[PDB]
Design a protein around this ligand. Structure first.
Ligand SMILES: O=C(O)C1=C[C@H](O)[C@H](O)[C@H](O[C@H]2[C@H](O)[C@H](O)[C@H](O[C@H]3[C@H](O)[C@H](O)[C@H](O)O[C@H]3C(=O)O)O[C@H]2C(=O)O)O1
Length: 766
């Protein structure tokens, strides 16, 4: 009987769940632990209300292939205890000391979301092709329906634009390797787009052929499928060379193989399955064995490739490989148990909404396919119940620069897929605000389908068909009753929405101080804010996407100097490629407090600044939303030494600067900021043009943004207070302030022209 290794968790590993430190949000709980030393090992899990773990009251789960698990039945309410051990398969017995006992509590309030076991899952799975989206009877049923009404679920609209143009198009030549094997943005993007079109051709032609009973469309689909199965698996389009191209090729193969299964000949099936299996193997290895996301979960493309690649492929391949059976099980068990590391059940997505767009787009697909293949519904999990509200409060219709993180679209109106995603969650939740969002996004963004981040990723005519065939037709509800404030505690994101339905009065505000630091898609932007008020973008996310690994990306957008945030001694929060440091350079939402006409968020970004500057000791920002009109921002910095303080805000146009203020006027809206109190002395205020140090070529023929730079002279103690008053340009607003400093605390009294007052009571220590 061996000793069990119970390693101490790390910042970039999974944790031990559930515990007193992390109560379960689902019934039955999601169980994860860090693996034993013996990389080839199987586990046994004990659960009991009895702290002594007696037979009568212990549930036992044996032969657990993985170091994470979800039981197939919910638990009765009460106080629980659990522990795990090594399990010897042949001897059918535990063969190591049991783990530390951890405790958790079950209540009736917790969603009941069991995961059907492998036996169940395998037995409910169909064995005949097709399997993806529709099965054999569903196809026949649907085909009869199309014969009766050619516009069923919008079929002919799909046919007209997503099927027909493929008939007159030459089969996509196999993409070439990059000149010198040096990844170039242009060639990398084009290459994955090339492969995306191949998904479209194969998948749409095949579906059409079989829905319409048309041998000529299957032949067109086959011609594409075979040309592709013939591409070099170790060539350019490998996971290794360009995983974006790679992912896509697999998907196409999966669909062609699944829907042309009967149309292919003996060889053609074997030629295809052969090429499909090997390509899927590259991904499956990378995800399970290489990155090992059940240990190191913070891998963007790996996590994503679960739904985007593994799900369609493993379903295609079932019964034709025991590896695929294993891979599917991992994929389903992961999505049910550990998905997603970028989120908690609050619905927020740490990578930002834009990554939420892609991450969900694919999950939806996998969620759907899974539902359709084996009946299991991931949508019942709290996170998916709630996640629809994330783009609602962060990518609200009309907003261009009012959120955070890497954004391919930065500057455009919110992307179509955000709408389309939300509608899916509408369909699942019955929430009409979601259906409102879809409508308005879809409308504001028509004619946009052909942009690289849309065409290169999804076909909306297809996503539309899938939805309309599978889901109810939810009604829109005016977002007027939507609560102003939504806090996303699991990621450290606070948002405010006002009058979302009114383009003159619509306000979007988000403040972010995140325990994810500048890891993956996040930037060095803890204690940062963005402000879209009165129907315009005022305090913006600055710069352009340009390309991943551009200078604009790495030395501007990733950096604090591009945020609405402070600099300390001219230094910002760590935003380089080392992810341990990145995750260490974090902040958090200390507290949120709400009462009529006064919201207050407090963020601690102390760690974030410390990583690059050991002199920093305390970094607090308070943000006040006063009487649904204006903002008071409090910055409190303590160092071990005099350190200069720098306050930044970013705008599209040039800002005008006062002795202790600044003013920006956009096209229909403007705002001003006044530094009313600064314990470190009066700040010198500069307006900076452009993007210093950023290669002028990367934004050539684009509009240069501006930013203000309020600089307080060196001090070991900073207490800065900034009044922010946004306004409709038609109706400019002014707040008056008064300082009652003398005393234990420094008091500041604000009021408007109708003498409605606000009291800021600020202690002198923090
Ligand atoms: O560049 C695009 O055309 C693009 C379109 C999509 O809208 C999406 O925003 C896409 O984002 C991906 C990006 O191109 C890179 O692949 C990047 O990959 C990184 C990865 O996600 C992770 O952060 C880690 O640091 O590795 C990176 C890498 O060098 O590959 O992000 C992609 C993503 O996962 O969204 O950009």
């Amino acid at each position: 009987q061996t000793l069990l290794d119970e390693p101490r968790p790390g910042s970039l590993t999974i944790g031990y769940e559930p515990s007193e430190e992390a109560q379960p949000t689902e019934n039955p709980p999601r169980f994860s632990w860090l693996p034993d030393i013996d990389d080839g090992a199987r586990y046994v899990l004990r659960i009991s209300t009895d702290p002594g773990f007696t037979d009568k009251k212990t549930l036992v789960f044996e032969d657990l292939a993985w170091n994470f698990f979800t039981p197939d039945e919910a638990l009765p309410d009460g106080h629980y205890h659990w522990c795990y051990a090594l399990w010897d398969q042949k001897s059918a017995t535990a063969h190591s000391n049991w783990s530390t006992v951890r405790s958790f509590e079950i209540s009736e309030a917790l969603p009941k979301t069991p995961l059907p076991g492998r036996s169940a899952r395998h037995a409910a799975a169909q064995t005949s092709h097709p399997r993806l989206w529709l099965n054999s009877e569903q196809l026949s049923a649907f085909a009869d329906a199309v014969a009766k009404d050619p516009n069923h679920c919008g079929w002919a609209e799909f046919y007209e634009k997503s099927v027909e143009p493929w008939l007159e198009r030459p089969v996509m030549p196999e993409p070439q390797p990059y000149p010198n094997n040096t990844r170039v943005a242009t060639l990398w993007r084009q290459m994955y787009i090339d492969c995306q079109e191949v998904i479209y051709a194969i998948r749409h032609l095949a579906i059409a052929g079989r829905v319409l009973g048309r041998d000529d469309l299957l032949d067109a689909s086959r011609k594409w499928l075979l040309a592709v199965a013939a591409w070099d698996t170790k060539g350019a389009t490998s996971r290794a060379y360009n995983d974006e191209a790679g992912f896509r090729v697999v998907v196409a193969l999966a669909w062609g193989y699944d829907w042309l299964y009967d149309h292919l000949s003996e060889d053609e099936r074997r030629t295809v399955r052969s090429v499909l299996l090997e390509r899927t193997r590259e991904v499956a290895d990378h995800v399970i064995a290489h990155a090992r996301i059940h240990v190191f979960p913070y891998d963007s493309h790996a996590v994503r490739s679960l739904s985007a690649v593994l799900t369609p492929a493993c379903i295609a391949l079932q019964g034709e490989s025991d590896e695929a059976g294993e891979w599917l099980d991992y994929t389903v068990e992961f999505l049910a148990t550990l998905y997603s590391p970028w989120a908690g059940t609050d619905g927020g997505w740490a990578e930002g909404p834009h990554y939420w767009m892609t991450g969900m787009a694919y999950l939806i697909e996998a969620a759907n396919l899974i539902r359709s293949y084996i009946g299991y519904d991931l949508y019942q999990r709290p996170f998916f119940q709630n996640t629809g509200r994330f783009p609602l409060y962060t990518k609200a219709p009309g907003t261009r620069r009012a959120n955070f993180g890497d954004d391919s679209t930065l500057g455009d109106l919110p992307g179509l897929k955000l709408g389309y995603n939300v509608r899916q969650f509408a369909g699942v939740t019955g929430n009409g605000h979601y259906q409102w969002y879809f409508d308005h996004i879809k409308a504001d963004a028509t004619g946009t389908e052909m942009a690289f981040y849309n065409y290169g990723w999804w076909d909306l005519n297809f996503d539309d068909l899938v939805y309309r065939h599978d889901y109810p037709q939810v009604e829109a509800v005016s977002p007027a009753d939507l609560p102003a404030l939504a806090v996303f505690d699991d990621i450290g994101w606070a948002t405010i929405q006002k009058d979302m339905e009114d383009p003159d009065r619509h306000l979007q505000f988000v403040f972010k101080s995140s325990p994810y630091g500048s890891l993956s898609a996040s930037h060095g932007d803890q204690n940062a804010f963005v402000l879209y008020a009165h129907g315009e973008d005022l305090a913006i996310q600055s710069g352009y996407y340009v390309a991943f690994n551009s200078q604009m990306h790495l030395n501007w957008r990733r950096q604090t100097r591009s945020k609405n945030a402070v600099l300390i001694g001219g230094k910002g929060q760590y935003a380089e490629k080392d992810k341990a440091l990145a995750r260490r350079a974090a902040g958090r939402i200390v507290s949120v407090e709400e009462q009529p006409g006064h919201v207050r968020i407090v963020g601690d970004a102390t760690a974030a600044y410390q990583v690059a500057n050991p002199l920093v000791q305390k970094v607090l920002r308070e943000t006040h939303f006063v009487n649904d009109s204006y903002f008071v921002i409090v910055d409190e910095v303590e160092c071990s030494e005099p350190q200069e303080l720098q306050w930044l805000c970013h705008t599209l146009g040039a800002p005008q600067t006062g002795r202790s203020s600044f003013r920006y006027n956009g096209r229909k809206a403007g705002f001003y900021g006044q530094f009313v109190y600064s314990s470190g002395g009066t700040p010198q205020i500069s307006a900076v043009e452009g993007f210093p140090d950023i290669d002028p070529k990367e934004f050539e023929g684009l509009d240069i943004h501006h930013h203000v730079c309020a600089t307080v002279p060196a001090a070991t103690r900073h207490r800065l207070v900034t009044l922010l008053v946004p306004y409709s340009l038609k109706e400019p607003k002014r707040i008056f302030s008064f300082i009652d400093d003398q005393g234990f605390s420094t008091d500041i009294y604000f009021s408007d022209v109708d003498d409605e007052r606000f009291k800021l009571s600020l202690p002198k220590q923090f």
